[PDB]
């Protein structure tokens, strides 16, 4: 979900805003 | 190559890092 | 000296390896 | 709560489950 | 110069920008 | 505690992160 | 796995400290 | 401002890299 | 990609994090 | 030994006390 | 030219010199 | 001994080396 997702080649500056609180 | 265990340490660095003074939620088990 | 900002990047590399595949809530703003 | 708790010496191991999921 | 300066409480994200390439 | 010769070595880690692809210049000796 | 864009930010460590108080660009953009 | 329980983690990151290939002991308990 | 010269520099972190006081041996030459 | 075997994907808590002084 | 070439298996303690300022 | 020596501003490469094996 999150992990496998940027854990392979880094997630964007906003795909990790959604993970935010 | 170490595996999410190790890797996971890192990203969260980067995410509250993003989220400046905000928190976030961080479960390593899809 | 640097602060909260980078200082918990490192106390949730700990607080998941003790979880292990568990996951936790990381809010750094009391 | 945590991070100025475990921040400041480390926390203990058992103080660290209290945060987990 | 930047890390006297961001080494004691961490600079804002701007002031980062203004040592970029 | 260590000294700014362990404490750049993260904020460097935030520079060219905040910088993307681009690059910088880290110079620690004011 | 991640990617240079996490490797990098340890590269630096190791290249400052060899430096010493010297300084040194990076620009992980061939 | 954490304390040795996560300096030394640090610290043998650079004991190591001097070493090289060799090994060395970490007892951070004097 | 990096190498076991900058991978067991995180293993040790874990190894006295779970020692505690304790210290180890880190030899990365089998 | 050890490297090798937890750099490859962690090892476990105990096996790590294998390694403890 | 220096990411490429360190990040693949480290690089040598001289050739991180060449990028020294 | 060696923490508690380095820990406080670093110590120099050739100290490092009184620990290597």
């Known amino acids: ?21 | 190559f170490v595996n999410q265990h190790l890797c996971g340490s890192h990203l969260v660095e980067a995410l509250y890092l993003v989220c400046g003074e905000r928190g976030f939620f961080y479960t390593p088990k899809t």
């Not at chain 1, 979900?1 to 609180?21: D, F, K, M, P, R």
């Open chain 1, 1 to 21: 979900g999150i992990v496998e997702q940027c854990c392979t080649s880094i997630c964007s500056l906003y795909q990790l805003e959604n993970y935010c609180n």
